[PDB]
Paper text:
We fused the class 1 PDZ binding motif QSAV from PKCα to the C‐termini of the PICK1 PDZ domain to enhance solubility and aid crystallization. The purified PICK1 PDZ‐QSAV protein eluted as a dimer on size exclusion chromatography under reducing conditions indicating that we successfully designed an intramolecular interaction between the PDZ domains using the fused QSAV extension. The structure revealed electron density that confirmed that the dimer was locked by two disulfide bounds between C44(A)‐C46(B) and C44(B)‐C46(A) between the two PDZ domain chains of PICK1. However, because electron density for the fused QSAV tail from the dimeric partner peptide was visible in the peptide groove, this method failed in allowing BIO124 to displace the QSAV tail within the crystal lattice. The crystal structure that was obtained in the attempt to co‐crystallize with BIO124 represents the first PICK1 structure bound to a class I PDZ binding motif (QSAV from PKCα). The class 1 PKCα QSAV peptide has an alanine at the −1 position and is unable to make this interaction. The second difference is between the polar and nonpolar sidechains at the −2 position. The polar serine of the class I QSAV does not make an interaction to K83 in the αB1 position in PICK1. In the class II SVKI, the hydrophobic valine sidechain at −2 position forms a lipophilic interaction with the aliphatic segment of the Lys83 sidechain in the S–2 subpocket. These two additional lipophilic interactions support the observations that class II peptides demonstrate higher binding affinities for PICK1 over class I peptides.
Protein interacting with kinase C1 (PICK1) is a membrane protein composed of a N‐terminal PDZ domain and a C‐terminal BAR domain, and is expressed highly in the brain and peripheral tissues. It functions as an intracellular trafficking protein involved in the internalization of amino‐3‐hydroxyl‐5‐methyl‐4‐isoxazole‐propionate (AMPA) type receptors which are localized on the surface of neurons and mediate synaptic communication. The PDZ domain of PICK1 recognizes and binds to the intracellular PDZ binding motif on the c‐terminus of GluA2. PICK1's PDZ domain is unique in its ability to bind both class I and II motifs, however, it binds class II motifs (i.e., GluA2 (SVKI)) with a 10‐fold‐higher affinity over class I motifs (i.e., PKCα (QSAV)).
Residue numbers in the entry:
A (entry chain B), B (entry chain A): 18 to 109
Amino acid sequence: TVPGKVTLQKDAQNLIGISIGGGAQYCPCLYIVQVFDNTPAALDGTVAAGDEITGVNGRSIKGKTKVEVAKMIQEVKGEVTIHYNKLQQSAV
Amino acid sequence: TVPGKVTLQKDAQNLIGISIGGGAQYCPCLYIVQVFDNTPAALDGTVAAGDEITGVNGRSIKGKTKVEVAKMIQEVKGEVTIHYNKLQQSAV
């Protein structure tokens, strides 16, 4: 677990270019599921598939659904600071 | 949000071509993070990045580390059955 944050410029459609997963009844943690090609997320290159989302613009995501965190990100315009954890996976 | 199970054939390196996340303290649930190209999991089409792993060959991974989860897939030769939830994610 190496912690961080990064600020991504929204594109013209007010998207940074990620899907967020988790935040379900028994799975409190929130994760970046895909980084879509050719989006600001994709081009900065800090975050990746599998990284955990700990915060948006200086605010926890603790106990929120993926929708609520998706809203937290839409509502921010122009740029957005995604708090994360780079995480390991086990290949199989 | 849909439970299922897929039996897959191990390759010659006794692998199926997925990655595993979560399975950690404060982050109980376990996820498929990458599906690797030209591998059985990818060639099979059933599973995608972001789906929950919930069981293997009839056993529940409940409460295990991703290290342990990988152990359990690597143990079974020839083919392994993976129990999973197809999940969704909010795009931003």
